[PDB]
Amino acid sequence: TELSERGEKLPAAQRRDMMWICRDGDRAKNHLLEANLRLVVSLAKRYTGRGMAFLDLIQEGNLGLIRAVEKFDYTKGYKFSTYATWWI
DNA sequence: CGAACCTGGTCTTGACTCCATTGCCGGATTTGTATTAGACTGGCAGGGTTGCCCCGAAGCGGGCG
């Protein structure tokens, strides 16, 4: 982003492997989301019985999980599920 | 027949005054968003009844040998 202005000229190998890292991060993000979808279902399974549909509850839990993997930190050394349960 | 008057709408002006129209400001309340770090990771209406249409075995008769 700070390179897209006239910050620096683009070397070929540096450009292509920084593109590889930038594309790899999104695949890792999607991998984490696709991992914890089951936790989302296991949390949403008990808020039924009033008003909304079960798939709607699951989808809003998915959106909360996207927010949780946005604002998740690992240097506190805790498991992901205890942090994401709150946001879901 | 001429003058004075009474009272008809007719109309101006000066003063009062009163209430809507913004307008600001301070506060109260009301609505909307972000954040909570132990670990937790795949459910439940539901069937039953009645009636009608579409494809598959099967005789089977005609073409085939």
Method: cryo-EM
A25 vs A19: CA distance, rounded Å: 10
Q: What are the tokens at A15?
A: 């450009």
Residues near chain B (nucleic strand), Cβ < 7 A? A 35-39, 41-42, 45-46, 48, 54, 67, 71-73, 76, 78-83, 85-87
Question: What is the CB-side half-sphere exposure of residue A2 using CA atoms within 13 A?
Answer: 0
Q: What does the DSSP assignment read for A20-86?
A: HHHHHHHHHHHHHHHHHHHHHHHHHTTS-SSSS-HHHHHHHHHHHHHHHHHS--STT---HHHHHHH
* Resolution of the PDB structure in angstroms: 3.4
What Cα–Cα distance (Å) separates residue A49 from each residue in A39, A53, A54, A58, A63? 20, 9, 9, 14, 21
What nucleotides of chain B have any atom within 7 angstroms of a protein Cβ?
35-44
The nucleotide minimizing the C1' distance to residue A55's CA is: B43
A3 vs A14: CA distance, rounded Å: 12
